[PDB]
Design a protein around this ligand. Structure first.
Ligand SMILES: [Zn+2]
Ligand SMILES: [Zn+2]
Length: 57
């Protein structure tokens, strides 16, 4: 379920965020909270309904 591969957006930090939409785990907390927009799932383009942060790097 959880995994910590490379954050697909930055590619520097691991992914530390499961996007509660579809269960895609792909972003990192800092990427999310830093960028303010309504963010879309980087993999599937669904709007994010909630973010379940994983406290990792
Ligand atoms: Zn990131
Ligand atoms: Zn998705």
């Amino acid at each position: 379920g959880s995994l910590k591969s490379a954050c697909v957006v930055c590619l520097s930090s691991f992914k530390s965020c499961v996007f509660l939409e579809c269960g895609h785990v792909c972003s990192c907390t800092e990427c999310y909270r830093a960028l303010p927009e309504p963010k879309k799932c980087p993999i599937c383009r669904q709007a994010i309904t909630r973010v379940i942060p994983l406290y990792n790097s």
